[PDB]
Amino acid sequence: MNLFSSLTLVTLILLTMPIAAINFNTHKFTNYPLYVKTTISCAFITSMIPTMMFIH
Amino acid sequence: NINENNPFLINSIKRLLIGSLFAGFIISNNIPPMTIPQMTMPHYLKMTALTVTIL
Amino acid sequence: GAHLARRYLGDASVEPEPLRMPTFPPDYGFPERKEREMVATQQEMNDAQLVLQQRDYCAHYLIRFLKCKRDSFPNFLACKHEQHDWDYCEHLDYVKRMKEFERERRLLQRKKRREQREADMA
Amino acid sequence: AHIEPRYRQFPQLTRSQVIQAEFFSATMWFWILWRFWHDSDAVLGHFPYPDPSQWTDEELGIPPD
Amino acid sequence: MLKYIIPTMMLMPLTWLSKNSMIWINTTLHSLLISLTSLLLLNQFGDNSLNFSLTFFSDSLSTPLLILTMWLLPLMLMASQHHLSKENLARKKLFISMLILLQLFLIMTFTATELIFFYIMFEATLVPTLIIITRWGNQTERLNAGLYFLFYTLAGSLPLLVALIYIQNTMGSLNFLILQYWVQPMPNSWSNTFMWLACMMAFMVKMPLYGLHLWLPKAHVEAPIAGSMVLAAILLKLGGYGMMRITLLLNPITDFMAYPFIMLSLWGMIMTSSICLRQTDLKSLIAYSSVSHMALVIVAILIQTPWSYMGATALMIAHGLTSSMLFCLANSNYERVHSRTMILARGLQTLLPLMAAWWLLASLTNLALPPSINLIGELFVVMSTFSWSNITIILMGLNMVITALYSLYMLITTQRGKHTHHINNILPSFTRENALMSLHMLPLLLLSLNPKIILGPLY
Amino acid sequence: SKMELPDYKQWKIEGTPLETVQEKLAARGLRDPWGRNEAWRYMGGFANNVSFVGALLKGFKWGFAAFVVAVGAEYYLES
Amino acid sequence: AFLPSAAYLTHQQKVLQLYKRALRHLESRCVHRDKYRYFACLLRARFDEHKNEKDMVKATQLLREAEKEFWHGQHPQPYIFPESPGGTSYERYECYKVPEWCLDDWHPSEKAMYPDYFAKREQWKKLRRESWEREVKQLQEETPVGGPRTEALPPARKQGDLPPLWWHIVTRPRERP
Amino acid sequence: SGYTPDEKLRLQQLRELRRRWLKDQELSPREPVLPPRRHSIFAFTHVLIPVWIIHYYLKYHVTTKPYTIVEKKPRIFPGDTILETGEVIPPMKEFPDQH
Amino acid sequence: SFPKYEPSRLASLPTTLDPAEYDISSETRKAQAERLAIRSRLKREYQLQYNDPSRRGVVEDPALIRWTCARSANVYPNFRPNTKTSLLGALFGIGPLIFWYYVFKTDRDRKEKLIQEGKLDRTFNISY
Amino acid sequence: DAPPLTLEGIKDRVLYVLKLYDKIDPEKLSVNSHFMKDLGLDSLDQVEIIMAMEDEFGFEIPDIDAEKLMCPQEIVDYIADKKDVYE
Amino acid sequence: ITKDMLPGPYPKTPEERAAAAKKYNMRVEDYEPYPDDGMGYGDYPKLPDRSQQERDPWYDWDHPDLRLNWGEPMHWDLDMYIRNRVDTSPTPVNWNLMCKHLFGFVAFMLFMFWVGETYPTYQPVGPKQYPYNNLYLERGGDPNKEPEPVVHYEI
Ligand SMILES: CCCCCCCCCCCCCCCCCC(=O)OC[C@H](COP(=O)([O-])OC[C@H](O)COP(=O)([O-])OC[C@H](COC(=O)CCCCCCCCCCCCCCCCC)OC(=O)CCCCCCCCCCCCCCCCC)OC(=O)CCCCCCCCCCCCCCCCC
Ligand SMILES: CCCCCCCCCCCCCCCCCC(=O)OC[C@H](COP(=O)([O-])OCC[N+](C)(C)C)OC(=O)CCCCCCCCCCCCCCCCC
């Protein structure tokens, strides 16, 4: 129960974090699109755990 | 100017290519049954989708 | 799909309506016709949380298959036998429904021959 | 070295894109033939479809009058 | 409420004794301090209103309108200090004094315990607004707009004066707290029919009702920017406030007196929204959209259900902030191109990207994007009108098509497309202007976090 | 920087369907003045493109080889 | 019909424009290059058949029924070039074509990032403002009475002068900014 | 026919001025003159610290309130052993074997 | 032969299928030349101000100001109450009000009649 | 992507397409070979040359500009001006 | 701008018509006003009711997005006939033929859905058979009452 719900909300909060990064910026970015791509790849990896323990 | 040799392009098409090969199999064998699948039907009616696609 | 052409283009009095059948009693033609045996207990398929479409006369194979599918994780390809058992018994239920359909069609043919014999006799 | 553009002729191909394209084509046909070898019933049919006209009146209960 | 009346009056010696470069900074600072102090009015209870004295009281209806009123004054001072820069110093102080006087009249309009004092403040708000329109408006038609704004309002309000004095002579009082307990049912008679019209038509004009709205696409258009801000954001809402106070006394005749006027709004919000599809004047488009949004508030007050009053007061606060920001955006382009014609300056996202982001946000709040309180008020009114009669969803839903279709058209015509070639005085966005846009939009977005404070006395 | 264009004299329409086009035009008294402009599309590496069943059966040979190897592997591995 | 220099299209111009529209719509109908090339030479023969027609009423009539021919045989979705009007990439980059005068509105801390560029822009602006009065007095000494007749502009007739009304043609944005 | 000599002269002069303008849109080698201005930290700041924050939030503020995280009760089969009771679920009735 | 193009209100006739397009008559030459002269004079009047270095602002377009004044302020001083405007103002102004009045009135009378007879399923309706 | 055109490259390509046209002998052609006066071509041939230029470079030349490009140097200068070469 | 360049009342005399045509920067032979029925048009020209998509796109317009020149008398519905909006451009197929084909196709498809709803396809089977009185307690039947015995037999 504690793993499932935590990683569930971690997926959504992790997806929201580059929006805060692009809104709280000063510099010209060191490849912000790579940052968002890495973020969504890791959100996919994080979301696979509640999926697998749903399959179980 | 035909060129497709960027690893971004190649890997991004490659992961959806692995998806378009295997993901129907993997998802259809991981999901639970929520209905009862109809698996008894006549031979003209079982082969209808493939035959209509080939036609 | 020939029965669609027989019901729509032929006559519908001898063809069985799908929405309301059997119109004949279940004992009409059977010496001591026994009931269908339900294997899974009502509490057992209640606690297995099966879909109400799936709580038919052959849900015990489905309970065995879902217990296999839980116990054989992550090897999701390791319960083909229980799945084929449940699919085969659903196939047998579908054959029983086809037998009910053909029984009703033959009894409507019997009633058609009965009324034609009664018109030709008296 | 990146691909130089050409004029009115076939472009420069890298070895890598050719071997990956052929590898995934062979992967597709391997998967189609493999699953067709093993399953063979999702395409051609799982269970035999019985003929209702071949059924006896005894098993369906049609008393002759 | 005297702890807000006396600082608002002390804004008069604060602006008439300030140095000639200091009269905007000091008034902006101390009006922001009054607006910070306004949050003490949120001492509300689930049963009892915050009843200060014999003269002043504040429930959860008057409280958000008070906070919005006391917040709107610094924003009007920021919006109006640019186009009055070359103005004479004493006329500049007279302008600020009229805004201060209007805030003073409004904050004891909303807290008037007794209804004839409500009427005196409610009609006292005409005179600074009239003077601001007809003195600091830009064009020739400000005089005719002042005449229309004065004479629809007084022709509506003088039967309200007669009817309120009649209630005083009949019930013995015009205390709203007394009239919560001594309210008698109003039966079916012609005398009570004209009683209902005399109690309602003044607020019908001030909302405005469709068919009586004709003063508004002049008075909102010919005014200066502070005049348009206070007319759209606060002065329309005096009508809805007065309706929510006066329909206590108008039961059960309202249940069959509301039928024409409900039609006049349910069709009228289709018409004025449709009118916003063909407005060439951007400021007139925002005016007709204000009529279109207040028609839903008219329907929600006339059907008198709890969901309807909650959606009506949420939509009043939300429309106050949204229409005030839309007029400030229209002025930010008028201060550059010197024409209110919407087709003139196009492609402005290429030239002003952050200002185009503010245009996007104010358009999305105009078209009721969830979870904004525009959508909260819109949605609760739609729920209550569906429960009223199920067919009304057609006139609701069709409205929500057209409300999108002028909101993004206003976004597409002004900001998108190719920029106009012959216009070359498009300066970058001043810090005052972006500050103004943020001081509108950021409270409107933060109120989605805690919307229960803008949902009226029966949340 | 400076790109070298190939020779214009190497684009000849003999052996291409432009030759069939020019013959059917000369059969009714016409001549084809833009043949060598279109000649590069039917020559070089863009000549002899596959058919549609050859397009679908791309990689079928190695896929069939890997299939036969894997079927033999599981046919021996069961024992 | 509608042209900047000429008031009308001549009959010869109408035949040429119908020929080009017919070949483009034919290429839209006749996708492959050899098949288009065959039918395009056939259409060229059809236009060569009535080339030496001297009766202008007969030529205008043939052009009119050739337009009706084209209108019956047009493609519903003709091929449009991507930057041609009606294209997929047409007026796509117009959001990136910022005019030059906005560079005047820049802050001096972001003008100091490009010292040579703005130092070179200053002599362009100076050249424009010293050429402006000479080219206005060139336009007024050459335009006929009643205003100009066509929208054509004269060139720079003297040495040292720039052509009149040249700034927003020369300093237009690039097609790919 | 094509251009008039005035049109050719005007297009040549506009073309020369346009090519000078486009050349003068180039950059200097010093330009843009700018003013003078941990391997898996993404798995720490963007993942692991949010798992900490969200686990604290759900454990001590959300699950401490009723019916906030409501889980579907787990699926029970004939033949299972309950962890909270030890009560063995009795297995199914013997099958009328079909094959 | 070929089907003739039938032009409509929202699908106009092509330029090449209009029989007035092929006018070689001298009066049409005069009309096209005079329109060319008007357009060239307006073009020159625009781009003298448009290419001005001293001008910094908006080249005002009296066609545009004229259009907005016709769309906004000229409507009532050129209105006459006659048969056409009165029938269109009664048909489009009070007509839909009468229509939606009778629709919503009939609906609410039917609903209230069902409610006070205990007929409307109002089982869980407690938000209103 | 998108290689930059130059005046020499555009000149090479325009003369290359014109050297593949069987109504122009490629030894008489130069950069100033007028199509109607020097090369002796029809106006239909000039339209087909401009359409081959469009198919070569990938952008439509309008007819008000197509009916005035009467030498290959005019075509090169037009493609140069409409594509902004030598930046 | 001043008084004599603003729109005025409907012209009746030919000199007033000529002054109006000179005001709107167009020829007298091309200047038609709206018919004087008192709708509020005045002297404003009835431009020929085309969309701005039909304007020549290769022409150098003063407003290229609008395809409209400076000083040109705008259409009364210029904000309506922008290229983001209502198009009047000539269609390859006739308008009436388009309306007839689309109405015929939609009406024929809805008619055939009504026909197929009247004559549905199905399978030669009986009803799906459920135990425990067609699952009486599962479908929400109350346990204090008792259903009639629904019995299914072997076949
Ligand atoms: C109490 C504490 C609260 C803390 C949390 C904050 C809560 C909300 C507060 C207000 C949030 C908006 C403020 C920033 C945007 C406005 C200015 C702007 O555009 O700046 C761009 C700029 C970044 O862009 P840039 O590249 O630099 O230049 C801009 C370009 O010129 C051109 O830029 P552009 O056009 O490319 O980009 C503009 C783009 C435009 O983006 C869009 O148009 C997309 C948004 C709409 C569709 C998607 C969202 C739909 C709704 C779902 C989200 C809400 C619910 C989510 C929760 C789950 C579901 C319930 O804007 C965004 O993406 C903004 C992201 C956030 C959007 C919020 C919703 C606005 C949409 C309209 C209303 C919707 C309903 C109401 C929602 C209210 C939620 C509370 O941002 C900043 O520099 C940030 C400035 C500082 C922001 C301060 C925020 C707090 C203000 C309150 C102060 C007091 C309280 C203290 C809180 C302090 C927190 C740190
Ligand atoms: C914005 C423009 C439109 C504004 C509309 C304003 C409202 C329209 C209706 C107003 C009616 C007049 C005031 C009514 C006050 C009612 C108070 C009361 O106790 O009534 C019961 C009293 C009843 O008398 P009573 O209460 O003393 O008697 C005891 C009770 N009974 C009757 C049982 C014995 O009503 C009256 O005495 C008369 C009421 C009707 C008055 C008709 C004259 C005015 C007609 C309408 C004018 C509308 C505005 C005109 C200007 C427009 C612009 C130029």
Ligand SMILES: CCCCCCCCCCCCCCCCCC(=O)OC[C@H](COP(=O)(O)OCCN)OC(=O)CCCCCCCCCCCCCCCCC
């Ligand atoms: C299960 C039930 C299913 C039922 C299905 C059938 C019912 C619906 C029937 C269809 C109704 C909607 C379609 C008609 C309106 C379409 C408007 C639109 O998108 O127009 C596009 C037009 C320009 O686009 P276009 O010309 O296509 O672009 C080519 C590229 N230049 O853009 C413009 O011209 C801009 C126009 C802006 C203003 C639009 C004004 C009209 C608004 C119509 C609202 C209709 C609301 C209906 C409410 C019903 C409530 C129940």
Ligand SMILES: *C(=O)CCCCCCCCCCCCC
């Ligand atoms: C009777 O035929 C029962 C089957 C359902 C009705 C007919 C369906 C016909 C289309 C499916 C088969 C197509 C074969 C090419």
